[PDB]
Design a protein around this ligand. Structure first.
Ligand code: HEM
Length: 154
C-alpha cells in the first residue's frame, strides 16, 4: 500500500505532539495494551509480575521500554514508507528473540490509536485516525512479510 503525502502529513502532525512527551505516551500506550490484552504482559520478562495499574505506573522499566518502543516507531513513521532498513533488525529480534505474533502488533496499534484519540482529540479527527491506521497497517504488513522471510510468520 501507499500513503499519500497528505496522509503522511496528518500522521506526522499528531506524532509531533506525542514527541513533546514520549515517556508519558509510552506509559499510557503500554498500560492500555496490558489492560486490554493482559496476555501481552507475559512477553515482558522484566515486568511480567506487575499486578496493578498503579504498579505499572510506578515501574521505571515499563516506562523505559515504552520510550524505546515509541522512539523506534517514530523513526519508522518519519521515513514515510521508505523504512526497509529500519524494519530489518526489528523484525529479526521480534520474530526470533521475543516472538511477538502479528496479532499482538495489532493490539498495540489499537492501543496507540486509543491514546492519541484521548490525548489529542483536536489533532486526531477522523481523517487523521484513518491516516494513522493506514500507516500502522503498512508497518504491520511489511513486518509480517519480513517475519516470513525470517522463518516465523507469527
Ligand atoms: C509499534 C510496535 C513495536 C515497536 C516499534 C517495538 C520496538 C522495540 C524495540 C526497538 C525494542 C528494543 C530492541 C530490540 O529488542 O529489538 C523492543 C524490545 C522488545 N519488544 Fe518490541 N516493539 C513493538 C511492539 C512490541 C509488542 C507488541 C511487544 C509485546 C507484546 C513487544 C515486546 C518486546 C519485548 C519483550 C522486548 C524486550 C524488552 C526488554 O527486555 O528490553 N514489542 N521492541
Amino acid at each position: 500500500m501507499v500513503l499519500s503525502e497528505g496522509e503522511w502529513q496528518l500522521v506526522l502532525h499528531v506524532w509531533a505532539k506525542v514527541e513533546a512527551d514520549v515517556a508519558g505516551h509510552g506509559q499510557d500506550i503500554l498500560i492500555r495494551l496490558f489492560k486490554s490484552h493482559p496476555e501481552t504482559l507475559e512477553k515482558f520478562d522484566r515486568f511480567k509480575h506487575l499486578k496493578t495499574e498503579a504498579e505499572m505506573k510506578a515501574s521505571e522499566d515499563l516506562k523505559k521500554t515504552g520510550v524505546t518502543v515509541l522512539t523506534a516507531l517514530g523513526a519508522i513513521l518519519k521515513k514515510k514508507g521508505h523504512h526497509e532498513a529500519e524494519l530489518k533488525p526489528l523484525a529479526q529480534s521480534h520474530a526470533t528473540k521475543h516472538k511477538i505474533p502479528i496479532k499482538y502488533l495489532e493490539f498495540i496499534s489499537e492501543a496507540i490509536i486509543h491514546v492519541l484519540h484521548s490525548r489529542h482529540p483536536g489533532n486526531f479527527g477522523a481523517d487523521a485516525q484513518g491516516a494513522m491506521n493506514k500507516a500502522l497497517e503498512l508497518f504491520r504488513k511489511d513486518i509480517a512479510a519480513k517475519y516470513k522471510e525470517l522463518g516465523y510468520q507469527g
